[PDB]
Every structure is written in C-alpha cells, then in structure tokens.
Structure 1
C-alpha cells in the first residue's frame, strides 16, 4: 500500500501532472538541468508527505479475544477467529464479546456495558432473544447466545469507512482549483507566444524552449512542496502538544470548521459514573446519606458492580475507599437481585448495635415498610415529586434507607448519579464558542440524559431524537439540523447523515469520537478528531488523534490550525502573483520582442521563489478569532493586480536597457542578468507584504523567513555580478541601482495590497 499511496501523490493534483509534461519536454530538449530540478522537487513534495504519513502512521499503530464454546457437545476454549456464525456460544460474566448474538435461554438476565462502542454508560438489562452487540463487557450473569455474523457494528464501521473517504479534502479541492486556473493561464499565455513564434518563422526547438520557460513559472513547481511543508511543520507543533494528524489536509480544515459535533459518552464525559451532591433529598445527613450507600455495597472484585464502584471513590473524606469499612464488621450481605432490586448489608456497631443499611430503586426502597415514616403518603409524594423532578433532570435515581435490628426501617432518601462531563469540557466548549464555531452534540444515549449535559455545558438544551426526524432514506431537513442544538439516540448511519446535511449546505464539520459508532462519520468528517479513549476503528478513521486526556487540546490545536492557514494564505496569494508576473512578462517579451530571459535563469527563479518560502512554515502568524474563509474570488483578484504591478514594473526596467547609453546600465551590464536580478528581488520580497495583515510593517518577519529571503537576494545578486549563465559581467554600480529601484516597487506593492486586503468594497466587487 505504501508504494501505491506514494505514487498517487505524484499524480494527484493538476499542478503535479504538468510537471511530467515539463520533465519530458526538458528531457526531450536535452536540458538535463531542468529535468533534474522539477523531478528532484517532485520527490520533495512526496518527501515531506510520505515521511510524515509514515512517522505519524507509526504512532497510531503503537496505539492499536478468546471464547468458551461447545463443539460437538464438549466444552472447549477457542479464539475469536474461527467462530462460524449461526451457532450457539456460551458467554459468561466479565467477558469481551467477539460478535453479535441472540440470547437463547436465561433464568436471570444479563447486564452488559455498551459504553465502548455505542456509548450507553448505564448497564442495560438484557432479555432472552435480545440483540447483543460485539466488544461489550458483561457486568452481570451467565448466558447462551447464538451468533449472527462475523466481523456487526465493527463490520458496519469497516464498510462505511471504506464507503467514505471520497472527496479527498476541502484543501485538495481548492488546491486543485487553483491548479486548474493557473494551468488555464499557462495555456492562455502559451497560445500568445506560440502565435508569435509562428509569425516569425521559428524552429520548433526555439518555440519549445520558450514553452519550457513559461510552464516552469506558470504552474508553481514548489507550491505542492511548500504548502505541505507549511502544514507539516505546523503539525510537528501539534505532536509537541500531544496531538497527531494522519492526513495533513485536516489541519487547514480545522481552521475552516465552524461546527463542532460532539459525542457525550467518551469525548465529553469521563465514562465513570458519579453523583451530584447538591441534588439530594431533605435527609438530615446530606453527606452521611451517601456514606450509608457505601455501607450497603460490596468491597472486593466479585461484587464490584458498576454503580457500586461509583460510590466507593465518591466520598470527600480522605479515606473514602476505607471509610466504608472502618471497623463496621459486616456479617452478611444481600446481593443485587433482578426482581427485588436491592442490596442491603448487616454491620455491627459498638454496644451490640446491629444496624442494617440498604440501597435500591426508589419505589422498592420506599415500600420496605409503608408506615415507617410519618405522613406516609406525603413522603411518598415528596420523593416521587422529587423523582419527577429527577427524571426530568435525567438523573438515574437510587433510593437508600436504614433499619434497626428489631426490623423497623427508616427511609433516608434518594440519591442521583450519572456520567458527568470533564472539568475542562465546560470551558473547552466555552471558548470554542469564543473561537467562532457553534457546537452541537451527537450521542446514542437518551434525550433526557443528554438534556442534562446540555445545560451543564450551557449548550442550549434543544435536542431531538434521531429516529423520529432524522431521515431513514432535503432543504427543510437542512434548516432543522442546522438549527438543532444536538441530536440524541443517534445510530452510526445517522451520524454520517448529520454531517451529510452540513456539507451540502456548505459548512465545514469536525467531530470528536471514541466509539466505533461515529468512526464511519470520522472518515467523512472534514477533521476527524479522536480522544484519549478512542477505539481502534476510531483512531484508524480519525484524521487527528488526541494523546492527552480531555478535549482541551483542541483549542490549542485549533489556534495553531488557523495560524497554518494564514501562513498558507500568505504564500498562495504570493505565489500566484509570481506566475501571473512571469506569464505576462515573458508572454509579452516573446510576443513583442521574440526574446526571453534565458532558460537557465528561468529555473533559478522557480527555485528561489520556492526555497525562500520554505521558511514560511517557521514564520510567525496571527490566528483569526473567526473561522477562516479561504475567500478564493478575492484571493485571485488580489493576485491579479499584484502580478500586473510587478509586470508593469519589470517592463519599465527592461525597456530602459533598450536605450543607447544603457538606461539603467551605468557602466556595464547584462540584459538577462539585470532582469533576473530585478525579477528575483521583486518576486522574493513580495512575501513580506502578503505575510502581514494590512500594512507590511504591522508584524515583524520571523528570522527564518527574513534570513531565507535575504540570503536568496544575495545569491540572486552574485549571479548577475559575475554573470553566471548570462552575458559576461554586470558592475556593482548597476546592481545597487536595481536594488534601490526594486525597493521602490516594493513600497508600491505595500500600498496596493493594503488598499485591497482591508477594503470591504474589493471583497464585494470580486465576489459580485
């Protein structure tokens, strides 16, 4: 696969295709210097792309079952590879399930945890004949299951992920889109020079030499190399903040995203049950009432029920784990039952005080003794009204009580619990709303339990069932999903469709997921985000995996994601103008004059425009508070003008050399050398205007970029002085004339770009 994914990188994208057209043309012309550079630089685009994809691919691979069966009537243990579907398997407590199964016959009912794949943090009591899902963990009981199919939400995940990944990316779309348009401008100026090269009868070798020189500059040879390098170097900063990208295009899409979809279970919540204390009943000991609950629980791994484990570390007392058993001397314990739904414990107290403490469902705790409390029907209504508040609050409800040895119960009260969101996810949402993107939540849990997490997070509490209005198989649908604050009870194929609506309306969408349910959606998503607790199908399908616990790393990731865009936005505005420069300038030079800057000097301009902007990746950039735009019609119009202003400036300089006595030549100079000196200085410094918001002096250039250009300007200066690949020599006095004149053109460019970039009108005029 590695050789296949590498060689498609050479092909894909219109910029790259014409390079083989350039490479064969230069090879056919026996100009092996031009053959080496583009073919050498084409490998560099792969070199940045392949090494990162291999290295980051190594990290996610570092992140990446046996069963008891009855075969021919005798019981053996076999791994999960050779189970043949449509056959009865015996699975017991605590196991991880290979495949889906139908429960055959059970006298007591199973409880398995569905948090891992489909996200339900409450263990579901499961009946005979029920649909069971793979990879779950059994928390209660014994059972026989007949399996349905081999790997199937795992099989559903793999099929949909393979179905997805079409539409290479938002970046590659605009990256191809610029590549097409520039190729049209290459054809537009090639026809102008081919018309002229026919009228003056020219040998085919001369015409192709002009054709070779234009196509090197017209389609940017370094743009696939630079822009991938710019996002790859930025991606290294992500790896230094514990965030790994798999395919690079997501990082710019993470800048351009303005809807974040979230899964409640793994991404938002700690998937460990916990209790809210301020939401407890009028019991006299608010804190001691949960201490009663820990008394009624098992203490070792046989009876560590999922809810019972939540109580043990819920205490604020420093010995929370040990405080439930400080010399209480448990005599006997009642295990949890399907029908009585209770756990009660007998403990011994000083002076021979046999006291008993219980846990259970609120209805079954309340009916231990009907008359034990005063006003028995009112305390009935008092908790049941509170449970009615509690059920509308989405909290799972558990009642506790206490009895004396002789057998009179005293009902302490009812206590709630749920899966709570992380501490940072309250804020990580909050400045995500500051950072310009609306957030939504997509979960397979119930609506009411998801409503609770909405107002805790402050989302808006406007969520809807997936099944009832998410389409089974629309513009009115588009309005609803966009206006929906979130969707609950969602299935994997609905989560993909929630994205499908938003992509069609034009939104860029990123979503966070751990389970295999939204792993199909992760591949579809513009930015696939995984968390520290992500499943293997998620981490394979996610474009970005978070190594750190919590979701707080996205704000770190998003801020530098927008910085990479402005680093790329500055370069792509810059690099199109250079092509549009030399397309006009060489196109007119060949048309009017049938001369051009020599083919050896043309390729050096392509390198120098490239290598100076290789340091763009290390340039400092500001992040926009709003989601970024990639406003292509303005980008093209701003690069239309700056290339012409360059084109006028180079045409002023060139025609001075036509005059007798030199014009711009003061003592002696080379007509090719001076213009290459002129062009390189004018092209290279164009990066300084574009890199800065508004005026070019607003932000100080980074030493990497500034050093890169200034070194390249020196190498540009040496070439014309000693006259390499050109006419013999140019004196220093002519050179300083070109430098000071190029500073004049540079200051002109600052005026135009500033008057374009901050102007509200030019954006409107170029859009329409």
Structure 2
C-alpha cells in the first residue's frame, strides 16, 4: 500500500552510499553512481516507453529519460542522479495529492417481505416482480417503486426531495423506492423491475455524471509537448552546426548537446504545482475544511458560481415555531401548552417543534388521555376533559383566521390549527429557518463575485421565503434529475460548486465542477462530494474559495520562478558562459524558492 515511496528512499540511500564510494576508490564509485542513475531511471524510462507506444512522443518523461541516458555516456552521473531525485520528489508529492457508492447501496434493503395467498415470505430484492404485493414495516425503506394499496399512509421521501416532512399518500398514489414508512405498516404493489427503482435511477445519474467528467490536463504536459521537442531539436543543432560549419570537434559538441539535454530538464517546475497544492490541502485541513485530492482544489480555485441546496444546507433543516395566534380569551401560552399537550410523543417534526417550544418556555405539559390519529384530518387527544385536535390548515374550516392563514402561508410558513369541540382555538406558524451564518456567507461570496442560486426540491413558497431573505434566485419542486439539468446548464456558462446535504444532491454534486457537502449531511452526500464542511459553517465556504484562489496564484508565481531561472540559465548556457553543474545548482535554488513560496499558503 505504501510501496510507492520505496524508489525514493532507495534512490536516496544508494546516492549517499555512491558518494561514500567516491570517498574510497573513485572508479568503483562511478559504477555505483551509474547503478543509482539506472535504478532511478528505470520506471521513468519504461513509463515513457509506454507513452511513445500510445502516440504521445514528447511527454516530460521522454525528456527525462533521454537526458539521463545521454548523461550516462558523459559521466554526468551525479548530476543525472540529482535531477532524477528532484523529479521523483515531484512525482511523489503529486501522488500524495490524490483522492483515496456503498452509502447509497445501503439504501437498498437486501430482503423484502412479499405477500402471496395470505402468507409472508422473505425474498431477495431482485425476486420482486411488478404486481407483487410487498409489505413495508414502520421505519422500513421501500425496496422498490410501489403503488400504495393501503388506504392512507405518510412517507419520508427525503431521499428524493431532501425534505423529511412526511408526505400524506392515499390508495393508488405512487411511492418511490428509498422512501420511509413513518408510523404505520403499509402494503404496496411493486411497480419497478429489479435494478430500475428510484434509488437505482439516482445511482445511474451519479455514474453518468462521473463519466461525463472531462479530465483536466496538467500544465507540465501541455508545456512538455512544445518544450521537450524544442530543446531536443536545439541540442541536435548545437551538436551538428559547429563541426559542420566551424570544423570543430565532434566529441565536444556531441558532449555539449547531451549536456544541454540534461540542463533542459526542468526540475523545480515538476515540484512547482505539487508543492502549492500539498500546502493548500494542508492549510484547508488545518482550518475545518476537508478536500479530497488536488484536482478538487484546482476546480475550487476556478469556481465562480454556487448552487445551494436549501434544507439542511442554508437552513438548519428543522421546523421551528415562528408565530402563535390564539383566539380571544386565550393566551399564546395556553394555545401552545394545549397543542403541546396533544402532540407530546408524536414523531412528526412539527409536533416535536411544538413540544420544544413549550419546553424552552417552561410551560408544564399536562398529561393527555386517549391520544390518537384522526386519519386524514390530524392528531387528536383529550386534555382535561375536552377533545382537542391539532391539524393542517387545509384540513378544517379556518373561520376568522382565513386572511391571517393566507398571509402566513404566502410568507412560506406552515400553519396548524388548534381545534376544541369544532371551535378554532387559534393557529400556530412554523418555518425551517436560516443557519446563523448563511446571510453573511452569501454576502461574502457576492463580494468575491461568486453568485449563488438555490436548487431545492421543496415547495415554491417555502423556497421563496428563504431565497427572499438571501436575495438569491431559485428553482423549486425539483427531483434529482432536474437538479442535474440545472447544474449542467449553469456549468456550461461557468464552473460551479454544488453545496448540499442530501442523497438527492449527490447527482448534482457529480455534475458540478466540484461538489461540497455539509458536515451533518447524508452519508451519500459526504461520500459523493469532493469536499466537506465538517463544521456546518457556511462562511467556511468563502475561506475555501479564498484559499483555493490563493493557491492558484501561488502556483503561477512558482512556475514563473521555475520557468524564469531556467530560461536565464538556458540562454547563458547557449552563450557558453555557464555549465552543467551551475545549471543544476540553479534549478535546485529554484526548487528551494518555489518550496519556500508554497509554504506561504500555510499562513
């Protein structure tokens, strides 16, 4: 697993020891150097050789191998060894900056419970045929896309919408695989073939997105494609031109040409980009960021747009009561203590929100008796003698709260009614609220010229409230495929980062230049993403985008340094005022410089 580092160490030891043999009995030591040079040159020579076969004649590996082989014939073994060492360090630095679908596979159960002849049987998920009647227990995931046979049921379809608010479904309604039966036990007619469920379609979206990802070419190869054949041509010329036109020594100009091949090897340049990225990834890691591989850092560097998920990303992902409006003769705390009295024990996030609000206010929740679900209306219990029902605003006559209810709902709120003996005792508003640092984070992104857009699977109103708060545009009521399409459309215009916390964000994340997951997000999200906000602080996005950008600057400086000195020591060499060892020393100095520069990212 770590045999990648071995050639480096072996080259080091072999080097130092070869020097030790240049301490007693030189000629025996030069053979040892030739051994070092050859063993370090081996993987690079065969690697290059494979590249020549694949059409690619002039990768940097070619230049390196040719220059080493030439340096062998001219006893520049110590130097060739040195440059090989630098190259190996660059290669390894690059290798360490490399990224190391199970979480989504865990969403498909392994067995289903099938019903035949009034007998239950546990079968493999792929044994399921359309028309089969399957039975999902409470809390269980649908193994396949089903049509509800049960009269009524609520489902957590967050794996498709990102919303944990249970969806009321009745006989005939389609329920997608991965959905969760929240309270009851359901029966469904399987609709989907094996391998063709909603989860499977998500997986397919992810795979396709990953396949459409174009690999970015390194600077060094685009460069080498012109530089390498150039300095080879020139070295041929400094070999041919002088003896053919000045009647000079073939030996000395052949020698000189090969020396130019070794000189031409741009050390520092190979360590140029890897040194920055290694520092950047190390700096991000130090301040609560998580980036998987250098390519991710480069993409992060070239990003100018952000697409946000809403629920769990921009918002805390939990309902919270925002307003309490009682009827006359009733205090807000009475309406609240009554609602909490009914809702206690219920798992519906709105109920939990109400109970919470009662608890932070130190309102003692009275015991409820005969608590039950009033199916398709709401949940009902009797508190201190009287039957009180808490229900959705569309389930009961508003009478005298109509206008207020409309006002609340248009503002992106969710309203529940408290009703005792068919009297509306008052309403309660709830909303999924913004995270503490969402606003400032957005404003900072805008300061960096990075515009945000919102892609959410939530309803238009709930979205429009939040997007209203942050001054962003939005697309709402979106399924995963729709997010992928939106993201593609935007990403064709400019490189985009997708920030989400949900399974349904996963395909979008892969469709974007870079996907970024919230810390509290779904495992699928954290695994699909190229990066992670381990703290759930949205501000830590700007930092990332800042760091990345600084990194992209650092590189550009480094290259210049590496490419500048080289140039100088290229031209001087061509004027005949500088030699091999000086050029090696200079490339080494260049390397020290780009290193020291790369270390500035740590500040």
TM-score (norm 2): 0.78
- 2:33 corresponding residue in structure 1: none
* Pair 1:245-2:257 in alignment: no
* Pair 1:143-2:187 in alignment: yes
Q: Is the 8 A contact 2:283 2:601 kept in 1?
A: no
C-alpha displacement at 1:319, in angstroms? 4.2
Mapping of residues 736-747 of structure 1, within 5 Å:
none
- 2:403 corresponding residue in structure 1: 385
- 2:419 corresponding residue in structure 1: 401
Sort the Cα spacing of 1:599 and 1:158 in 2 relative to 1 into closer, same or farther, 3 A.
farther
- 2:584 corresponding residue in structure 1: 603
Sort the Cα spacing of 1:536 and 1:318 in 2 relative to 1 into closer, same or farther, 3 A.
same
- 1:491 corresponding residue in structure 2: 479
Mapping of residues 632-647 of structure 1, within 5 Å:
none
Alignment partner of 2:331 out of 268, 273, 285: 285
- 1:343 corresponding residue in structure 2: 379
- 2:514 corresponding residue in structure 1: 527
Q: Is the 8 A contact 1:296 1:358 kept in 2?
A: yes
- 2:501 corresponding residue in structure 1: 514
- 2:94 corresponding residue in structure 1: 49
- 1:452 corresponding residue in structure 2: 465
Deviations 1:234-260 (A, max 9, x none): 212222223221121222332332211
Sort the Cα spacing of 1:231 and 1:163 in 2 relative to 1 into closer, same or farther, 3 A.
same
C-alpha displacement at 1:453, in angstroms? 1.0
Query: 1:162 and 1:3 mapped to 2: Cα distance?
Result: 31
- 2:527 corresponding residue in structure 1: 540
Deviations 1:382-435 (A, max 9, x none): 4222232233223222111334xxxxx442222222322222223222222233
Q: Is the 8 A contact 1:342 1:358 kept in 2?
A: yes
Mapping of residues 242-281 of structure 1, within 5 Å:
242-277=288-323, 280=325
- 2:368 corresponding residue in structure 1: 330
Q: Is the 8 A contact 2:66 2:261 kept in 1?
A: no
Sort the Cα spacing of 1:335 and 1:511 in 2 relative to 1 into closer, same or farther, 3 A.
same
Mapping of residues 198-209 of structure 1, within 5 Å:
199-200=245-246, 209=255
Deviations 1:359-389 (A, max 9, x none): 112354437xxxxxxxxxxxx3x42222322
Sort the Cα spacing of 1:272 and 1:527 in 2 relative to 1 into closer, same or farther, 3 A.
same
Larger strand proportion, structure 1 or 2? 2
- 1:124 corresponding residue in structure 2: 167
Query: 2:282 and 2:58 mapped to 1: Cα distance?
Result: 25
C-alpha displacement at 1:40, in angstroms? 3.2
Secondary structure in 2 matching 1:397 = strand
Query: 1:205 and 1:524 mapped to 2: Cα distance?
Result: 58
- 1:110 corresponding residue in structure 2: 153
Query: 1:422 and 1:117 mapped to 2: Cα distance?
Result: 22
- 2:557 corresponding residue in structure 1: 570
C-alpha displacement at 1:182, in angstroms? 4.5
Q: Is the 8 A contact 2:159 2:504 kept in 1?
A: no
Deviations 1:477-525 (A, max 9, x none): xxxxxxxx222223333333333333433x2211112223332332232
Query: 1:258 and 1:397 mapped to 2: Cα distance?
Result: 38
TM-score (norm 1): 0.63
Secondary structure in 2 matching 1:149 = coil
* Pair 1:297-2:297 in alignment: no
Alignment partner of 2:271 out of 208, 216, 225: 225
RMSD between superposed Cα atoms in Å: 3.8
Sort the Cα spacing of 1:210 and 1:143 in 2 relative to 1 into closer, same or farther, 3 A.
farther
Sort the Cα spacing of 1:524 and 1:88 in 2 relative to 1 into closer, same or farther, 3 A.
same
* Pair 1:18-2:30 in alignment: no
* Pair 1:234-2:280 in alignment: yes
- 2:114 corresponding residue in structure 1: 70
Sort the Cα spacing of 1:186 and 1:543 in 2 relative to 1 into closer, same or farther, 3 A.
farther
Q: Is the 8 A contact 2:480 2:507 kept in 1?
A: yes
Query: 1:168 and 1:451 mapped to 2: Cα distance?
Result: 35
Secondary structure in 2 matching 1:501 = helix
Sort the Cα spacing of 1:130 and 1:366 in 2 relative to 1 into closer, same or farther, 3 A.
closer
Sort the Cα spacing of 1:524 and 1:331 in 2 relative to 1 into closer, same or farther, 3 A.
closer
Q: Is the 8 A contact 2:516 2:530 kept in 1?
A: yes
Sort the Cα spacing of 1:599 and 1:418 in 2 relative to 1 into closer, same or farther, 3 A.
same
